[PDB]
Design a protein around this nucleic acid. Structure first.
Ligand SMILES: [K+]
Ligand SMILES: [K+]
Ligand SMILES: [K+]
Ligand SMILES: [K+]
Ligand SMILES: [K+]
Ligand SMILES: [K+]
Ligand SMILES: [K+]
Ligand SMILES: [K+]
Ligand SMILES: [K+]
Ligand SMILES: [K+]
Ligand SMILES: [Mg+2]
Ligand SMILES: [Mg+2]
Length: 1331
RNA sequence: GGGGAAUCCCUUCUGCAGCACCGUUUUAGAGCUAGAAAUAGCAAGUUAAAAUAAGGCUAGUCCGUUAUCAACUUGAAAAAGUG
DNA sequence: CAATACCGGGTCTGCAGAAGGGGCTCCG
DNA sequence: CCCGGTATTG
């Protein structure tokens, strides 16, 4: 009884099949449990588990951190109120109480309904004096009068509750506020540097031009237009562009011949500038510093739209300017509409359902929707010119709380808050005492490297405390151990050295690590000259001289430099051939040069006695992000450097960690030699052993010490091991389900393990990332293509338009512009032709006018194209509009193009699976099946695990006409698993040598020919072979081209396949999140315990975690007469814990009396019920059902539908295509037959009378359509019959809306079916017998 | 052939922490005039408070949406067993 | 109860890791 | 997107 298993692992299915050595699927009588009259049932050993996708933890995390934010914001307000408590109680002992109950209806309020002053006269007067809170804030900042303590509170609380972002470090410099003054500063600095060509900036209103609500490039154009003799690409123009936030290239200004682009926003700018100043000189540093200051002022002027010399509240003044312009323009608009369009006034100003002013203020119309609505109304009237300008500036009738206030820094709000505190502390002493406390409430921020301020009950926290006491914003530095916490943040996540598992890894930018990388690469360099017999390694002295002369004088070392500045200069070689390195060295001493620029003491860096110190310094710079903490840690070294050097040091920062520890690189020593790994890399006689050789050499202690260093740990469980794999959670859910399926199948075969297990794994918002990429790329390029052709993210899902923007509107193979309106006439071409690499991503595609201009089609684009286009391609690459892989493949021709080795490798890659995750699946199954060791203590591999790629079975299907149509039913998953088992077992029976390629555990033209013809033994004629294929050595039959194909056909024709939908409890959010207005409906759910939804609104649409079958009695009528019921009650996610804690009490609270506790049945989503005539339903919820049957369409119809619809591609030969076409035409009647099938099924099982009649009518309407189109729309038709939830579909232009099953009553008397994972073991419960 | 390691350039995905801005909901921001009222005419509108999973105990400036789940028997449970 | 229709909260900064092309020096 | 909740209309 030998058998194999085939598995098809996906993100929503695991297909499975059992085969015998004859490639047949067995069938068994399985026992049926329960209370029906059926005791057993015949099952085929083939099927597929279906499940909803496993989800990532991201949404859960976003909601978790948002929860924390709400908690802490409330705590800020609570701190402020605790500071105000006593004095407020003297002024008004219920102010804070009225604030707390402001949400309650007057009936529920325990105090006066007017929050601020508690009487209507004073409240109305307040709102009249201060129509916005920004009025009050400006008044309290500017006035010198004693203010009412309640108004002071409201201003401070408003600033603290909505406090602005923390994107900018430090204080908001008052020097860099004025645009005019900083523009003059930049001009003065430039004219200092360029006395012969000064700039005349008098009469230039720099403020108006540079702060105008316009695009960066337009403002640059305007300013340059105010300067005759100066162009926007000259030096001053580039400085202005850098100030405005563009990415100017200073290459041409300073004649660099190598690009020097600068963007103040990028993280690398600080180095980029220091990279430019290195080539230009340090006299230009003040010029770029002036540019940065001007940039800060322009950024501020974006938010502060008012003069900062009439008020210390420019932000509140700008909000008040919004309010005043809103008022004036609304008065004008009302007057103009009343005069010119009186009939539209009611709609514009009263109808909240429309997107006019009423919908804008009272309805749900956004600012953008209101603009779009009212723009034509302004265009049709006269006197609306300035209003239209404001609308196009997005500056018309604005509110003050708006989507763009995210631009406001917290330093602005802090300025206003501090000003108020300074005004009013002269009258309230508790404000003087607590001023810094209140400022700290605004400014204090839990660092991202500290985490939740927990006390042992958070699986997320890592913060440690210096003293056990409550943490507040004011004692945080004293109570939280910031250093230990920031260190734990990183060290919970960084790797240990795999060779020394108790050793932490070195910083990536450590001096020792970079020395290691440089010497490890340098020991394998070889050189040869004329008088040398063979190439020679570099000696220790030569390597040391190369490091001291080249690596310690240049950031990068090229082969050319090696030849000229070392071999010529030192060794007196005029010609030398180098091997082991190409073009330039990969490793380099970048940290050495950074630190040499900072400390300016080469002798310090070269003195080994400072190694420790330098290591620690880099450690600090890597471990911490906060510059104050960095300075604290570096303090011990302050006596070694000047204070300017210390400031430069603490401004330097690094990130990233290496792969090896310090103890491995330069700690452990070979016993005999006394040398470390790095010692050997610096000098190792004439063997020049590199790292791998060193740790694998039996004549050194390194291997032995690495072996001893391995430590034991607690082995993960199966679920733990699967969760810790690298991959999407969806594929991991599939992986675990696969293991459980295999366990059940082995149990089904009497605990006999299979001979083979063949596994195949499936291959695998968005427009937002596409838009992001195109925006950043065009910005880096400096192109105007988005100005001339604006595009929304959705449109970028079109392949050709996306490619058009990625290529900056140009042909990729020809130096010409493309025309947008002509995309349909252009071609999308594969860089590496798809006949070698099946890659259809953007990474292997380009848009070109005509693909013929690539060159020959049998290779990579020609060398001529590369010569033409390489510089444009490099510009695209630096703009991130193409990747390094795309650039390398486009330019491969100059490197020889595609070789025969490359093509053979491409074919092998197409056939042999090499993904790490599939290898991990194979290892899991192999270690579970094979557990015994032989006399040599090697594993006994009694079960062979074979991995296949989908292409093998796909090609098998297409070659032998075992076609698949995914839409017909779910059987194709199971058929895939079956064909996987067949092909894999036959393949390794035919070529056992292939086991290394395909079984887990253990000339170019020739291999190309071989792997391209590996599946020919199935065929009868090629491009002829015997009818019986055998193994050449064992002589055993592997394939019989008579019976075995008929066996496969019989398997695929079997109507009884075990499709099982995994029943799952539902988890997640309680309900829809929308907070609905109050309504007289029991559907509403209170958002807080006492917030009666009929008064306060609430949620609806809760999610049912699972249903429950209740047999009980319910009171009926006014008399409350008990009546027996049997019904389905949906337990919601929110109710689940309460129901499970005590079900009887819960059901009695819901109204059920005398519950039959032992008759309660838990019914998760997709619980299966069978009714009459084989009709099946699945539970969608407590009140809705899903389709429960599979339509087993016969195989001839499936193949006719595949051929008639042109499913996939025809391929083959024209004669075979003609035979397929003649088959389609000879079996046209199949169409009607297929329809009949559907109809029959729909009448037995679906019961959608109206939809079925509409479908039959639509089919009889398009009987004159081409056979191909009728076949495609018949493919569409199977949505009516598919398993699962009903869904709308389209037959030609007719739309069929889904017929839903809006009642679950019938299943309460049907047969409930409990299924095991394979569906082979069943328990059937007749529910009509309950009650 | 298979498996593995460091470096370089890129790319994708996964996990975690810390912020901001809005949105929504109820209340507050005295609507006026005529008319008995039904209604009509006009005025007005930009702001705020509070909640933002119900909530929980472990009471922290913590936790509350990921993963995992046929049924039956034995078991508090974990888990084991059952064709 | 049937047919039908509408609806659904959203976007940053920072850190660490695995793994996929392309290359290169090595190991078992 | 999808598909289960809800209301409307009957
Ligand atoms: K009251
Ligand atoms: K000019
Ligand atoms: K609105
Ligand atoms: K190189
Ligand atoms: K750092
Ligand atoms: K010093
Ligand atoms: K779940
Ligand atoms: K889910
Ligand atoms: K590698
Ligand atoms: K099940
Ligand atoms: Mg809360
Ligand atoms: Mg709001």
């Amino acid at each position: 009884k030998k058998y194999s298993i085939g598995l098809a692992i996906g993100t929503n299915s695991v297909g499975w099949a059992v085969i015998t050595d004859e490639y047949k699927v067995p069938s068994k009588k399985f026992k049926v449990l329960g209370n029906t009259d059926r005791h057993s049932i015949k099952k085929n050993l083939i099927g597929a588990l279906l499940f909803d996708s496993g989800e990532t933890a991201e949404a859960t995390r976003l909601k978790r951190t948002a929860r924390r934010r709400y908690t802490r914001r409330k705590n800020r307000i609570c701190y402020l109120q605790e500071i105000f408590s006593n004095e407020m109680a003297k002024v008004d002992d219920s102010f804070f109480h009225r604030l707390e109950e402001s949400f309650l209806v007057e009936e529920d309020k325990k105090h006066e309904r007017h929050p601020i002053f508690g009487n209507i006269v004073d409240e109305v007067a307040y709102h009249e004096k201060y129509p916005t809170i920004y009025h009050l804030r400006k008044k309290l900042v500017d006035s010198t009068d004693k203010a009412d303590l309640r108004l002071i509170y409201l201003a401070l609380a408003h600033m603290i509750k909505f406090r602005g972002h923390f994107l900018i470090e430090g204080d908001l410099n008052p020097d860099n506020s004025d645009v005019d003054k900083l523009f003059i500063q930049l001009v003065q600095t430039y004219n200092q540097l360029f006395e012969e060509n000064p700039i005349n900036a008098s009469g230039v209103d720099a403020k108006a031009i540079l702060s105008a609500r316009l695009s960066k490039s337009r403002r640059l154009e305007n300013l340059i237009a105010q300067l005759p003799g100066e162009k926007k690409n000259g030096l001053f123009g580039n400085l202005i562009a850098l100030s405005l936030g563009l990415t100017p290239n200073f290459k041409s200004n300073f004649d660099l011949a190598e690009d020097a682009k600068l963007q103040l926003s990028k993280d690398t700018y600080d180095d980029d500038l220091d990279n430019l100043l290195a080539q230009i000189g340090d006299q230009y540093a003040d010029l770029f510093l002036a540019a940065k200051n001007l940039s800060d002022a322009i950024l501020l002027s974006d938010i502060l739209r008012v003069n900062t010399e009439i008020t210390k509240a420019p932000l509140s003044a700008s909000m008040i300017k919004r309010y005043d312009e809103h008022h004036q323009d609304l008065t004008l608009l009302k007057a103009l509409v009343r005069q010119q369009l009186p009939e539209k006034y009611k709609e514009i100003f009263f109808d909240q359902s429309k997107n006019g002013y009423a919908g804008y203020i009272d309805g749900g119309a956004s600012q953008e929707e209101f603009y779009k609505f009212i723009k034509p109304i302004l265009e049709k009237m006269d006197g609306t010119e300035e209003l239209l300008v404001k609308l196009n500036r997005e500056d018309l009738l604005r509110k003050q709380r708006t989507f763009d206030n995210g631009s406001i820094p917290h330093q602005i709000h802090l300025g206003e808050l501090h000003a108020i505190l300074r005004r009013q502390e002269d009258f309230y002493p508790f404000l003087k005492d607590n001023r810094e406390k209140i400022e700290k409430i605004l400014t204090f921020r839990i660092p991202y490297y500290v985490g939740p301020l927990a006390r042992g009950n958070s699986r997320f926290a890592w913060m440690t405390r210096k003293s056990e006491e409550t943490i507040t914003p004011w004692n945080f530095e004293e109570v939280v151990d910031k250093g230990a916490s920031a260190q734990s943040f990183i060290e919970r996540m960084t790797n240990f050295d795999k060779n020394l598992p108790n050793e932490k890894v070195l910083p990536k930018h450590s001096l020792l690590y970079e020395y290691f990388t440089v010497y490890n690469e340098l020991t394998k360099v070889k050189y040869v000259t004329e008088g040398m017999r063979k190439p020679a390694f570099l000696s220790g002295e030569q390597k040391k001289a190369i490091v001291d002369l080249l690596f310690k004088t240049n950031r990068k070392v090229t082969v050319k430099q090696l030849k000229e500045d070392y071999f010529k200069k030192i060794e007196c070689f005029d010609s030398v051939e180098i091997s082991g390195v190409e073009d330039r060295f990969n490793a380099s001493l970048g940290t050495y040069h950074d630190l040499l620029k900072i400390i300016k003491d080469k002798d310090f860096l070269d003195n080994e006695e400072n190694e420790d110190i330098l290591e620690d310094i880099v450690l600090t710079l890597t471990l911490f992000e906060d510059r104050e903490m960095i300075e604290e840690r570096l303090k011990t070294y302050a006596h070694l450097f000047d204070d300017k050097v210390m400031k430069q040091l603490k401004r330097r920062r690094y990130t990233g960690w290496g792969r090896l520890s310090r103890k491995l690189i330069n700690g452990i020593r070979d016993k005999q030699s006394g040398k470390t790994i790095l010692d050997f890399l610096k000098s190792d006689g004439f063997a020049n052993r590199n790292f791998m050789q060193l740790i694998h050499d039996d004549s050194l202690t390194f291997k032995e010490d690495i072996q001893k260093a391995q430590v034991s740990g607690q082995g993960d469980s199966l679920h733990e091991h699967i969760a810790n794999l690298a991959g999407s959670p969806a594929i991991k859910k599939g992986i675990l389900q696969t293991v459980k399926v295999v366990d059940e199948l082995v149990k089904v075969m009497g605990r006999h393990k299979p001979e083979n297990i063949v596994i195949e794994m499936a291959r695998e918002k968005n427009s937002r990332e596409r838009m992001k990429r195109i925006e950043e790329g065009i910005k880096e390029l400096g192109s105007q293509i988005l100005k001339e052709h604006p595009v929304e993210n959705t449109q970028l899902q079109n392949e050709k338009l996306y490619l058009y923007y990625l290529q900056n509107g140009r042909d990729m193979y020809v130096d010409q512009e493309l025309d947008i309106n002509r995309l349909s006439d252009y071609d999308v071409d594969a860089i590496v032709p798809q006949s070698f690499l099946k890659d259809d991503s953007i990474d292997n595609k380009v848009l070109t006018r005509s693909d013929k201009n690539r060159g020959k089609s049998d290779n990579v684009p020609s060398e001529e194209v590369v010569k033409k286009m390489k510089n444009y391609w490099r510009q695209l690459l630096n703009a991130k509009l193409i990747t390094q892989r795309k650039f390398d493949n486009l330019t491969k021709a100059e490197r020889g193009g595609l070789s025969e080795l490359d093509k053979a490798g491409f074919i092998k890659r197409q056939l042999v699976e090499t993904r790490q995750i599939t290898k991990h699946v194979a290892q899991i199954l192999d270690s579970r099946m094979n557990t015994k060791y032989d006399e040599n203590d090697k594993l006994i591999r009694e079960v062979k695990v074979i991995t296949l790629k989908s292409k093998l079975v796909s090609d098998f299907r297409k070659d032998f006409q075992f076609y698949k149509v995914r839409e017909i039913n779910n059987y194709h998953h199971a058929h895939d698993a079956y064909l996987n088992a067949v092909v894999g077992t036959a393949l390794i029976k035919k070529y056992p040598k292939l086991e290394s390629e395909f079984v887990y555990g253990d000339k170019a033209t020739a291999k190309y020919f071989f792997y391209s013809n590996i599946m020919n033994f199935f065929k009868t004629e090629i491009t002829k072979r015997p009818l019986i294929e055998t193994n050449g050595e064992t002589g055993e039959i592997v394939w019989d081209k008579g019976r075995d194909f008929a066996t496969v056909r019989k398997v695929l024709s079997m109507p009884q396949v075990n499709i099982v939908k995994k029943t799952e409890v539902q988890t997640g959010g309680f309900s829809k999140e929308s907070i609905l207005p109050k309504r007289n409906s029991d559907k509403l759910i209170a958002r807080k315990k006492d917030w009666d939804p009929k008064k306060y609104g609430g949620f609806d649409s809760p999610t049912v975690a699972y249903s429950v079958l209740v047999v009980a009695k319910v009171e009926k009528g006014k008399s409350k007469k008990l009546k027996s019921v049997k019904e389905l009650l949906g337990i919601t996610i929110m109710e689940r814990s309460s129901f499970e804690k005590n079900p009887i009490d819960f059901l009695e609270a819901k109204g059920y009396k005398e519950v039959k506790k032992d008759l309660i049945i838990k019914l998760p989503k997709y619980s299966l019920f069978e009714l009459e005539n084989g009709r099946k339903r699945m539970l969608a919820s407590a009140g809705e059902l899903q389709k429960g049957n599979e339509l087993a369409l016969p195989s001839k119809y499936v193949n006719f539908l595949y051929l008639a619809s042109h499913y996939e591609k025809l391929k083959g030969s024209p004669e075979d295509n003609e035979q397929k076409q003649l088959f389609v035409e000879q079996h046209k009647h199949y169409l009607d037959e297929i329809i009949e099938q559907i109809s029959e099924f729909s009448k037995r099982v679906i019961l959608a009378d109206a939809n079925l009649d509409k479908v039959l009518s639509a089919y009889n309407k398009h009987r004159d359509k081409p056979i191909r189109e009728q076949a495609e729309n018949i493919i569409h038709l199977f949505t009516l019959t598919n398993l699962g939830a009903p869904a709308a579909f389209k037959y030609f232009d007719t739309t069929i809306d889904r017929k839903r099953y809006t009642s679950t009553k019938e299943v309460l008397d049907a047969t409930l079916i409990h299924q095991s994972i394979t569906g082979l073991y069943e328990t059937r419960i007749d529910l009509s017998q309950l009650g």
